[PDB]
Amino acid sequence: GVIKPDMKIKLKMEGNVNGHAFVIEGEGEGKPYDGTNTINLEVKEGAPLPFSYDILTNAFNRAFTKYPDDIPNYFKQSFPEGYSWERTMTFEDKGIVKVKSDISMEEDSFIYEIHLKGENFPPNGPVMQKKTLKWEPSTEILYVRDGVLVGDIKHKLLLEGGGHHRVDFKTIYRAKKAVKLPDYHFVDHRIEILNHDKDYNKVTVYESAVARY
């Protein structure tokens, strides 16, 4: 196979949140057919980040999703050419993150080039004052729109103290060649920061994702 059962991950993100510019690079590995991936991440510019690292982690590849055989796999079919995605994250309190990523392949590695811009976050709200705990697990709904694939999620951040903040995600996935398109389906995922240093200059992220009817 062009996609191996064990794939490396290399990525760079250029981002700007509420006017604060930063660059993060990461290297990881995962199991595309098991739906798991792990990435080690270092802030290269812009340290220490003055906002919640959780608004970045979903940006750090649905080729790492476990799919049954009777649902066409839009992401894996796109390789070796790959695919790009554009995402909008609409926060409860009017903050917004717009992110784009290019996913390519180099031998047994996926390569991501990510650009992220967050703005209009309340300066003293939970994202900019780093009061998040994690993303709750959630379920993406995937379906074709306009020939490409769309993913909707109604997400929640768990905050310090136990409350939640809603965040709605819309992603448009665009394969770089014609692929067999799937009927609508769902992807159950979980994402976690496994470890971080004091200011999140060094972070390890883990995600698990499984498609189903």
Cα distances (Å, whole numbers) of residue 72 to 142, 175, 211: 12, 13, 10
Q: Cis bond leading into 182, ω under 30°?
A: no
* Beta-sheet pairing, 109-119 with 7-17: parallel
Q: Are 19 and 121 in contact (CB under 8 A)?
A: no
Q: Are 195 and 203 in contact (CB under 8 A)?
A: yes
Q: What is the distance between the alpha carbons of residues 51 and 118, in angstroms, rounded to a whole number?
A: 10
CATH superfamily of 1-213: Green fluorescent protein (2.40.155.10)
* Range 5-32 burial, b when 16+ CB lie within 10 A, else e: eebebbbebebebbeeebebebebbbbb
**Resolution for the entry shown, Å:** 1.5
Q: What is the distance between the alpha carbons of residues 41 and 57, in angstroms, rounded to a whole number?
A: 10
